[PDB]
Amino acid sequence: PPEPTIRLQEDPDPEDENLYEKNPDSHGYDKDPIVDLWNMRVVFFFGFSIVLVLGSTFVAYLPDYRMQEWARREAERLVKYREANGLPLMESNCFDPNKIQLPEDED
Amino acid sequence: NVLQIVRDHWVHILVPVGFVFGCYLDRRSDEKLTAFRNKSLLFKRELRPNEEVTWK
């Protein structure tokens, strides 16, 4: 059996390279220190500073397009009106029955 | 340096330009949906003396 046991021509599996070895203060972004530092800076500025803080403040101060206070004020004046006139607060019918035409059964 | 970093940073301007173009296209598409402007029963409003359209 003169076979080589080498099934094919293959490069050996390379060993993983440490970014801290050639460069302490390596930030884990790139092996080029300048590109590494600027990648860290842009990620931190546009992620933590711009989006995370300014966007959160923008969401906090969004105008009331859901009309929560509007509904509260409408309910307040409506309850004030019905309590003053003795009306039974909320009605059980959502629509007026006079304007609904039921089908006569005659069963 | 001008005329040198432009050849290396020209790509950066593209995303911002797209945002402006998209805003313009959104407004242009808005201009084609005015069939009911100042005609809804909820917001039938009489125009101000120096007004052309209620909204743009």
């Binding site: 099934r7 094919l8 599996d13 390379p14 060993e15 993983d16 | -």
Partner: protein
Amino acid sequence: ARQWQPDVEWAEQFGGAVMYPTKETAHWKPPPWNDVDPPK
């Protein structure tokens, strides 16, 4: 540490005359590299 890529044994699955070899079709042979058969 390295992404797996097909070896020779993986490639030889696709080297037969047909896929999914059977007892009847085992004796089949792949065609010649150029579509020429010896005139015998």
